[PDB]
């Protein structure tokens, strides 16, 4: 009877969690909105956008390119947007609607003063689910590469203490990053879930 009770409660919790995860990004929900923020001036945002782009519907604006991505291989729908730090209203708005924030880093330092400023503003407003990615680790010689990641761990551990660092070099790492974004626990924000937006 104790085993049966455990089975019943576990079935309840797992079905509720399955419904909650099935809502976002799927055919009965909105697209998963991902805002990409480079935290350093040394990051080439367009090539990373090439890496993230399965079919692409490339909508664009006067200066920004925001593209929809459909992948029935993993059965997931994305809306990828980009924002440069220092554009306060742009980063704050497209982070206050984003479901995921993808931070981009350079291998040498964690972030510049501008990236620190935008991170302070984002922490103030409220962070949704975020994912850290390092861009140019494979451009360094191999002899330093492992040590470089070790050093950058310290450069991350101050503000993102327990968070892994993914890499963005090739299409294969791009697919792995898309998989990490697709199946991941979602941070839910009270202000934007109490009101329709």
């Amino acid at each position: 009877d104790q085993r049966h009770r455990a089975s019943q409660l576990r079935k309840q919790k797992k079905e509720a969690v399955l419904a909650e995860k099935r809502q976002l990004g799927g055919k009965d929900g909105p697209p998963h909105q991902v805002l990409v923020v480079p935290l350093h001036s040394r990051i080439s945002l367009p090539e990373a956008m090439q890496l993230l782009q399965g079919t692409v519907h490339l909508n664009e604006l006067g200066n920004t390119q925001n593209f929809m991505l459909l992948c029935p291989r993993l059965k997931h729908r994305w809306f990828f947007t980009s924002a440069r730090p220092g554009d306060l209203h742009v980063v704050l708005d497209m982070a206050k609607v984003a479901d995921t924030i993808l931070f981009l880093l350079d291998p040498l330092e964690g972030w510049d003063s501008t990236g620190d400023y935008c991170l302070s503003c984002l922490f103030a407003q409220g962070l949704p689910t975020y994912t850290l990615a390092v861009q140019g680790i494979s451009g360094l010689p191999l002899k330093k590469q492992i040590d470089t990641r070790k050093k950058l761990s310290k450069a991350v551990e101050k503000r993102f203490p327990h968070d892994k660092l993914l890499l963005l070099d090739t299409q294969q790492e791009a697919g792995m990053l898309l998989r990490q974004l697709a199946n991941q626990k979602q941070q839910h924000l009270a202000f934007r879930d109490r009101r329709a937006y």
């Binding site: 302070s120 984002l122 922490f123 103030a124 407003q125 962070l127 503000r159 203490p161 924000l189």
Partner: peptide
């Protein structure tokens, strides 16, 4: 918010919302 109160009191870390 997955950060400690001791760090927040001493200014060692900030918390997210």
């Amino acid at each position: 918010a997955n950060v400690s109160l001791l760090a927040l009191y001493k200014g060692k870390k900030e918390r997210p919302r």
